[PDB]
Symmetry: C5
């Protein structure tokens, strides 16, 4: 029979369907099953404490008033324009900072109704979500980004969100991040919000992200080591080259301070000490100590042969003493940060 007649006969004023009334107005709560498909992930900014995602959201629920038997087809697709005339849950995101739909040629929405009365709703969304980040162990850090799906207006007596038993979260093939590696273990947990207005359903997903070290090695760790070796070079210069040694020391100190200031150019102003901060502090301490060493040598050398051998012995000892202690510092630093890094992500 004519397709157009069936639509309004089922969902029209003649039938009496009301899109403002729940499938069971007084009865067991509506159970909504959800799954998400992630199409792109990125734009993770530490400064603005947020990340941007683009996902497909699928919702499933049963509406007994939409049960159709006469029509032959088991499953019926529909037009996006008729979404306004069916009841839909009022899902919202708690950590939502920015949100928009897509209207490129039509509304990017899908609806499907089955014989039993089950409804499948799929929509395309772009959301910028907020993510609290801990900046300790900043180079060697593992972050967790959450996404919370909640009901704004319906209490647990009316609406109950649940996760799909198989494949709640899948990621698009070939998705990669420049600075992070997305782990394949996704955490599903139950959250419930309590307010002065009542109890509301909530569901959450946690994603584990591991920072990549290559950029930080090429950028920060290696030039600091080069400056330390450059300061070490001064021990092999003649003690009579006072302007040369002083200029080398001053240049190394100023360069170290500038690099230390610039190492936090793209981070939020936190109030604790990071590992990169410890590293720059130790390197600045080494360069300053080398300059103070030459200062002491120059002070000792002008005290007039006993003073000549005493000043020379300091240079000879420091030529084989400064690299060994720095090697010990590197062993103690790099080991314990893989012990703690290996600590369970949870």
């Amino acid at each position: 029979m004519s397709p157009s007649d069936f639509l309004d006969k089922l969902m029209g004023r003649t039938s009496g369907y009301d899109a403002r009334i729940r499938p069971n107005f007084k009865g067991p709560p509506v159970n909504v099953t959800c799954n998400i498909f992630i199409n792109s992930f990125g734009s993770i900014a530490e400064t603005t404490m947020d990340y941007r995602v683009n996902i497909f959201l699928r919702q499933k629920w049963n509406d007994p008033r939409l049960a159709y038997s006469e029509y032959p087809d088991d499953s019926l697709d529909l037009d996006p324009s008729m979404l306004d005339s069916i009841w839909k849950p009022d899902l919202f995101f708690a950590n939502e900072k920015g949100a928009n739909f897509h209207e490129v040629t039509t509304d990017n929405k899908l609806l499907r109704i089955f014989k039993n009365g089950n409804v499948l709703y799929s929509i395309r969304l772009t959301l910028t979500l907020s993510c609290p980040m801990d900046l300790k162990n900043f180079p060697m850090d593992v972050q967790t980004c959450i996404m919370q799906l909640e009901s704004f207006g319906y209490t647990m007596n009316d609406l109950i969100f649940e996760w799909q038993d198989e494949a709640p979260v899948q990621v698009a093939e070939g998705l990669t991040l420049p600075q992070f590696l997305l782990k394949e273990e996704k955490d599903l947990r139950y959250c419930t919000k309590h307010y002065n207005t009542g109890k509301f359903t909530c569901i959450e997903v946690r994603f584990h992200l591991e920072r990549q070290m290559g950029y930080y090695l090429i950028q920060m760790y290696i030039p600091s080591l080069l400056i330390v070796i450059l300061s070490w070079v001064s021990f092999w210069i003649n003690m009579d080259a006072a302007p040369a040694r002083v200029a080398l020391g001053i240049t190394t100190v100023l360069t170290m301070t500038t690099q230390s200031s610039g190492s936090r150019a793209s981070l939020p102003k936190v109030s604790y000490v990071k590992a990169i901060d410890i590293w720059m502090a130790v390197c600045l301490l080494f360069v300053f100590s080398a300059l103070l060493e030459y200062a002491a040598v120059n002070f000792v050398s002008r005290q007039h042969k006993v003073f000549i051998d005493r000043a020379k012995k300091i240079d000879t000892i420091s030529r084989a003493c400064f690299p060994l202690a720095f090697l010990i510092f590197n062993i103690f630093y790099w080991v314990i940060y893989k012990i703690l890094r290996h600590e369970d992500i949870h």
Copy 2:
């Protein structure tokens, strides 16, 4: 009885409800009780003199025309789509610079009507509010951010806003700020605006924010101290190392000036002197005075044995004199800024 019939029987042309007429058209003023829930706080920028907040706003008032007795349920939830057909107050924010609603899957709005005729309206909002800031005592400062809720069109004869006796403001659990600590004492006060058009109701809330010092210590205070000690190092060098001493002095002076210029990179161009400015001025004075000291020593030393001991005595005195006076300056500086910092926030 059928749910759909009750809605239009109560709020329809048949009933005669008009959403453009107040609950008591000629009578005592409408009393509206409000409470806010803060879901996220952040984005406090000194340059643009504003901060961004995301809040839930709850309004309560009594409408005698909505009193329902026949229906069994004590409390009735509704659909967000029917908000257009009820009377709502015209609340606006005085310090509102930017505002938007949320439409992620539906309107993020709630409405509830009680048997007596009381209405509860809840809406989700994102607002960028303006906050005048005083930048004196800039590192050790306590700010106050206000939010004013006002009626645009109704005078005190018609509309009166009030605060809830219990729990007007609550904050979401676990909310933290990178650079600030939100105090738990919230100030509620009465504001009334007077214009040439009449008298209007207003309510205000004040939040106290304390800046965190860790970032400023790691960033500004410690490198300046390092430069001061670096300039102090020059007193232990031989007086005959004129190029070395002059280069050290010049490098320290230029570095100090660059750091002083860069200490105000992210602040509005105010016209008064801050504490950080006093600190950089004192450190620049110390480095310049050290350079002038060596200048005087070099001038004295070429005046040809009396001139030799006289020039040496200056170096020996300055080696134990410069750190003591700087220690006294640190004692006087750091104490009085905790005395004044302890001054009552109000």
Copy 3:
């Protein structure tokens, strides 16, 4: 009598009111009186040549078709939703670059009708206005920001805008600007635009803004003076310290050039010479002249006792000659810029 009946009886198809027809279709022009209230002012950017304001706009005119006598109340407030059904003038801003309304909970609009037929319309607006700026005397400058209100579609035969005799412009209490001081004298003048389409009404307001000097003194003027004194220090060094003196001269010259380049970091690329540019040019000239002086001294000293006293006399003269001429330059510079600064703002 019932409130709802009066509204549509007065402004309905039964009455015959047409919102597309002027109050007097063929007759004397409509006279509109306007006043503005300024709620916030700021965001003055020299680069983008514009400033942002947030104002309340009040319009008053007489509509004989809205005269009501029967109803008892002298003055009737209304609902913002009914603005579409009354005639309103088509005011627009000539220097309008950006504009938006406010819809935080309702339309931020007010309407009031009186017994005689007078209408008061109040609306909240945010406008980014364009302001041509003259950058000569850049530190010591007084700017003028204009705002023009014009009719887009109605000629002088139909619409005539006028200013209110008392209190056209008032500013909110406690409004302050970080870098400017808003003067309390506001200029009201008559503007009329002439085009190929006809004659149109226009009204304008001029605001006087005075720049604050504290920021520029702390930032630019004092470090340049410090560099000049640092270059002056070289005159007291021994003439045999050639590397030290040359390094001091080069460092001062390079620092001066860098500061001169950085003094125009946040300004439009104008093609004339500003006062700050004259100041940096004079300081660069002083440092370069000092370096050329030492160059001449070094050239003279190697010409082999007559040459020894001749080279020494230059250093002794320059030690008491360079500060005096710089003091004379400061007297001539600072005086005449207060003479011209005192010139009437108009």
Copy 4:
């Protein structure tokens, strides 16, 4: 007779006017005459290769179905709200990157109909247009900004755009640009676009913009000359001041390289050589050649009286030889760029 009746009698379902049908459905093409008024011009960015303009657009065409004779007035203004009910051309801009209307209090639109059936439509628009720029002769360049007006849906059989015989383009009085001078000769030409869908009408206007040199002289050309003179200063220093001369050479070379890198901070990454690039290359060559000269002198001087006079003669020749060749370079550079600059703008 009543004004309201005439409007719907002329343009209503009773009359039979259809706004989807052209004035002559089958017949000679519709001829549309256009003129533009420029109210503000600016925001010319080389990086984003675009500029922003704000214009008034006037369109004129004849509609025989709108001919009115009975009503007395020769010319009838209308309300902006009735624009939807008349046929309008589908003009679009080819180089349109961004576009928006203005709705400050009403739609900024005008419509006027004459007795013969002629229609005048005026609208206010803000458009960011794309402009391909040639960066050779970058300081001394003349650009051309185009604007193309085209029909999206109508072929030449239906719609034909033309320019007004008198005053197609006029500019608002007092309009000025910070970095450019707008020439008073405007080029009007005929463009026709050919696609696989048919032939479409197009009209274009070309504006000539001349860059101002004052900013570039104060910023780039003069500090480079100062660095060249600073390098020249080294020729008058004693040949025994090896650290001083080497430090001067190195500082000049590094400063020149930094200025050369910074001279292209605000330009697109083009792949050809500009005039500023030639200038910096020549100045870097001069400083490097001076350093190589002192290197050769120092190498020659240690070859042990014949070697003493030979090394001294190089310094004496270079003291009067380096400025003369640089003067010749300035004569050859500055002349030919005014010869080519004088080349006809077309």
Copy 5:
């Protein structure tokens, strides 16, 4: 016959056309042929990993319900306003990050219907598409930008997208890019997406972009070579000029490190080694090795005639040894990157 009657007689409730039903509701799938015209291309940003394009999109399909025979004209243009009343495919872009229509004076849309029932739909779009980029061989790289057109709601049984046999992609004449060259070979391929909801049609186009080297040569490669030659200059200085040689070495090392840090100012933080990174590493190694060479020479020279000739021989060998090895490095570097660059783009 009257034009207005034909439109609603064909597409009206009287006819029974339903825009929610496919041309063949139960039957062979609808075949849609598409072609795109590119009007502007640009805004390729490595950081935000995306590019902006402005295209014309043409869709063709057959609708048997729109077959018209009586009317004389073979082809009928229409009005953009009637697009809502015809069935249109639900095309969407997979890599769509931002999208907007154009409404400058009317909707920039075209529709045309033929006698047989074929429909042509043309629309103007602006889309910011995402493009994964490989940054190895960063200066000498060839990128590929994709665009995927997919159906959101219809499975392969209903909708099938295909490419036009002649001229699927054409580019506007004279289109050029500042940093890239668009290749004239466009790749057309078949993509099919598989999800848990079904099978969906997809089509893709690949564009090949070649980076231009001129900017990188003028900017990075040549100053690094200048610094290397500047470090080479030190071999011709006297071994007794210890402050001069040490200062030259330190300045070259610090400049090299700063340039290496600044070479990645506008790139995403990738974790692999690029060619520019190899180049800067080799140049830093050369400057550091030169400084270590002078350090060894200075250490050897103070070991007290055998030590004099031994230290001199190192300088003489290094004066003809450092350029030859650097030339060999340039030959090996530049050749193999043209071998690999010549590798087929696919």
